[PDB]
């Protein structure tokens, strides 16, 4: 009821999130070719490199289409095939960004950190920072949870 | 300050992906894909109009509108719009029974979990974040609302 409630606004403001990104997103997107989903594996992979099975069950779906979407950005050349091996070798490919795709995520950073700047230049500092930090626990329970199952 | 956009981002794709995690056996058996129980869960808050729900999911406009005529074709959402809101350019759409059972046990299993998390929370340190929250989500309709 209460917590459901809370839950409800989450889900809410996530939307808002994704619907207002977008948004502001996509001449971007549509300068490099590529659709708003193609351009969430490209933000997966500036946090770091990985392949194919790794952002397909960490995004929770089908197999083929995420394979789908690699094959397309590799062929944009906004990612690229690596094997900087130093680690357990099975047979496995790791999938990193390429300069272009980098380009792309500063272009998308700058446009992000603009707006999100200036919906908040108002607001007090230490009360964002206070906040951050209930949200840094929710995603450290979040995360802990998920590695469970 | 901006290491704060790439938290909430993060922040956005835990989220995403532990409700992928809970919902998987839930969305196959009603021949939803994930994209569709945003849709329907977006419903549940509110009655809308497709020029309604286009603004709020706002991506191409047509890819939005297929997701709801197939929400209408699996009988998942209703098409209500009688005299009292209506007459403002296409329709009133809001779910239907199945729509209803299956935000039911959505709510069902996120409740629980949520409530495990945050059983040590303090009702008030939570309240105060989610006025902040609202504060934003606010100005982002705001602003989606524009350009």
Not at 35 to 49: P, R
Not at 94 to 105: A, F, V
């Amino acid at each position: 009821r209460r917590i459901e409630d809370h839950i409800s606004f989450l889900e809410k403001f996530i939307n808002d999130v994704n619907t207002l990104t977008a948004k502001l997103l996509k001449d971007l997107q549509t300068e490099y070719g590529i659709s708003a989903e193609q351009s969430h594996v490209l933000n997966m992979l500036s946090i770091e490199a990985l392949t194919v099975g790794q952002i397909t069950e960490k995004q929770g779906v089908n197999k083929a289409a995420v394979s789908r979407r690699v094959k397309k950005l590799l062929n944009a050349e906004l990612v690229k095939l690596e094997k900087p091996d130093s680690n357990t070798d099975q047979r496995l490919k790791i999938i990193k960004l390429s300069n272009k795709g980098k380009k792309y995520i500063k272009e998308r950073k700058a446009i992000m950190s603009h707006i999100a700047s200036d919906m908040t230049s108002d607001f007090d500092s230490k009360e964002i920072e206070k906040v951050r930090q209930v949200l840094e626990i929710i995603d450290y329970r979040i995360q802990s949870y998920t590695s469970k199952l």
